[PDB]
Nucleic acid binder design. Structure first.
Lengths: 432, 432
RNA sequence: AAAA
RNA sequence: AAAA
């Protein structure tokens, strides 16, 4: 899949020039037609600031004005309708109207929008044009794109190309080359932050205390998050630290994560004030880092949901999941931890023993004496510490016990064991 | 250390305006004075494109013209002269001049310059202003700065703030807010790139192939680097995968890395052709990703050189190096590996026995079953594999042997063991 | 609890 | 080349 993302400012103010790109040439006010002709992408995203809009009767009319002006300009330059348009919240005082709010709303808004567009299945070839962009929208869009692509790179091959034309200068420019400014294979970077404090999801920009306190207390989302926070941090730590059983057992509820992000986004939306008379937009609520973390968390769950299975969870599944999630010494750590349990399983099966509901301590033949659960042992043994894991082997008639034992031996956390694992992993994440 | 980095284009064409920032107010053509007043940095860096240059016979004439116009503008506005100016290789055709080369040279040049300015001891508070920047020079400078700060964060606390003013509309705007667009605690990111093939240090942009193959063959750098490559990759993998003994034994020669980077940078500099009459700059050689990797590699060595000591290496020294360098399950694996060696050493010291130069396999009491060195066992056990490591206890009179064994027990790779480990770690870095 |  |  080939994805073209372009950063635009006041696109209607661009002068007619010509562009050079992939040994093609082109005449007009935009790079987008020659980029589409050479790169031939499956999908195009246009990112710009709402600060070009002029219809101040309401928020939906402002977006409608900006969107009509993009669609009119696409027909003019001949670029086709097969496009997504991200209308980011911009800032500044202009003659045609006034736009106020946190500038970082643009990062959170674009991140949210891109998280619903970037495919969560298959390889990605991503092309980014900064040519026409505002400094601030371009930098925040670059950053949001890189953050989600780093997460998609845990499951899939992700390549990224950046473009920028030579500087335009009126009255002297004959033609602009579209330069390559980046060519990267994106490294896998799983989410590596805890969920923050409840002061950090939605922040007052210009809303008084009575309205904010009442609004913050009205949100189901912050109530339900208080309750799941430690479970979600447990899951984040499972990709970061190499804990394949914790990855499956703490796998988040995607419907639930959707409704948290929906409720925060539409509360941010409802707090935007549009004054038709003064031609002022005030974004009275600002997004905080916690909204960004939730968006990334949902995206990471969509990227990895292919690996989630129906319990019970076998050694063979834990190998299979681990091969997709983990690399380097992390992956070898997991294979050493799983291998020790698999070896004992092969020996039991060889002698027609099939233990059920047995603590991992007993299965491995450890001392009943060492039942304290340390951070050190939970983290250094892929989360499979002998005092928190229970083992069950299915009974079968073995023929090749060395190939068969692994799929027939199931592991789960004990109820008590899970809660101690959750505490250790949550705590290790927060002291990163 | 507080560090201010600024991104400038045609700084002289900016209009007088009012800036708001940190409760202060400033009237001027530049953000720089109000940024310096409010942030009070220890050091300022200005990054701009050489494509502003006017009457050039030579590279030195180009750079003098540009530097002199920056110093005129600094004096004219608030700012002082405790300033580095990075004059970056830019691109495009302008009234006064024509600049041809790889646009990505700006990234490698700014990365090289910042690697010689950003301090490599102590915490970093870094401020980045993009308001006056060219789109392409701004992204490449942001990226370069983030790449180096990620390495610095392995050893020190690094915080990063980015700023961008509201958009300027000519003749209309009056006051401009300087907005915050990023606040970040920079995550530790050790270098995760292998050194590339020998075609990726310097590439012809505009050079005859006879001239290029002759230059290549004349470079001591590429000859020496052919010999050192696997060793340098072993050391990169040691921080990445958690191998504290390999980190000490393969610690690279800083004087030689300096020499390789200066030869590549000097060669790129001399391949730059200036035609006085047609006012044309051609950078005949482009920097490749391998110049980037050598710069990051020298920086990560400077950041970590305070941890290095001479042989021998105690279990106590390896705990402390691991405590500074490693986190999560990587550190807890180091501690378990080292702890098993210490435990066994206490048992020997209790019996008054002080064995020397003994294979780790024999020291731990391993049998004969396997003597092969698997990537799995090297990477999963913090590079302390049983067949490649030799243990020496240096005899003392034990009183509290459980407190004393760590000081007096030393580990070393065997000469044959070091080679296999290098091959395994080098290959792991290249696959992942 | 031979690589727990 | 502060809405190429």
């Amino acid at each position: 899949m080939k994805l073209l993302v372009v950063s635009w400012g006041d696109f209607e103010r661009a002068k007619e020039t010509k562009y050079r790109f992939g040994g093609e040439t082109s005449v007009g006010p935009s790079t987008l037609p020659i980029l589409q002709k050479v790169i031939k992408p499956d999908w195009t995203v246009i990112v710009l600031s709402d600060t070009i809009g002029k219809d101040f009767s309401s928020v939906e009319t402002l977006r409608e004005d900006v969107r009509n002006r993009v669609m009119d300009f696409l027909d003019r330059i001949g670029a086709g309708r097969e496009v997504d348009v991200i209308i980011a919240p911009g800032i500044g005082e202009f003659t045609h109207g006034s736009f106020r709010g946190s500038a970082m709303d643009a990062y959170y808004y674009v991140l949210h929008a891109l998280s619903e567009i970037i495919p969560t299945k298959g390889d990605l070839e991503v092309h980014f044009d900064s040519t026409h962009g505002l400094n601030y929208v371009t930098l925040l869009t670059y950053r949001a794109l890189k953050d989600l692509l780093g997460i998609a790179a845990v499951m899939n091959t992700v390549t990224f190309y950046a473009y920028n034309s030579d500087p335009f200068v009126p009255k002297i420019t004959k033609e602009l080359n579209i330069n390559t400014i980046e060519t990267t294979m994106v490294k896998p970077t799983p989410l590596s932050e805890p969920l923050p404090g409840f002061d950090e999801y939605l922040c007052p920009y210009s809303m008084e205390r009575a309205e904010f306190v009442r609004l913050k207390g009205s949100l189901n989302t912050l109530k339900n998050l208080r309750k799941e926070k430690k479970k979600l941090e447990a899951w984040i730590g499972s990709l970061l630290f190499g804990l394949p059983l914790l990855f499956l057992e703490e796998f988040p509820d995607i419907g639930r994560l959707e409704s948290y992000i929906e409720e925060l986004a539409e509360t941010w939306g409802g707090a935007i004030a549009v004054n038709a008379e003064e031609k002022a937009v005030t974004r009275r609520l600002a997004f905080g880092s916690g909204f960004g973390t939730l968006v990334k968390l949902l995206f990471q769950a969509r990227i990895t949901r292919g690996l989630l299975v129906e319990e019970p969870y076998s050694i063979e599944k834990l190998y299979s999941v681990s091969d997709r999630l983990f690399r380097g010494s992390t992956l070898q750590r997991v294979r050493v931890a799983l291998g020790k349990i698999e070896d004992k399983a092969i020996k039991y099966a060889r002698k027609g023993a099939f233990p059920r509901d047995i603590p991992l301590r007993d299965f491995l033949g450890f001392d009943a004496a060492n039942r304290e659960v340390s951070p050190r042992n939970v983290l250094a043994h892929a989360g499979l510490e002998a005092n928190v894991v229970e083992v069950s082997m299915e009974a079968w008639e073995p023929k090749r016990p060395e190939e068969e034992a692994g799929r027939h031996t199931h592991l789960k956390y004990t109820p008590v064991g899970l809660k101690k694992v959750e505490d250790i992993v949550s705590r290790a994440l927060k002291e990163s």
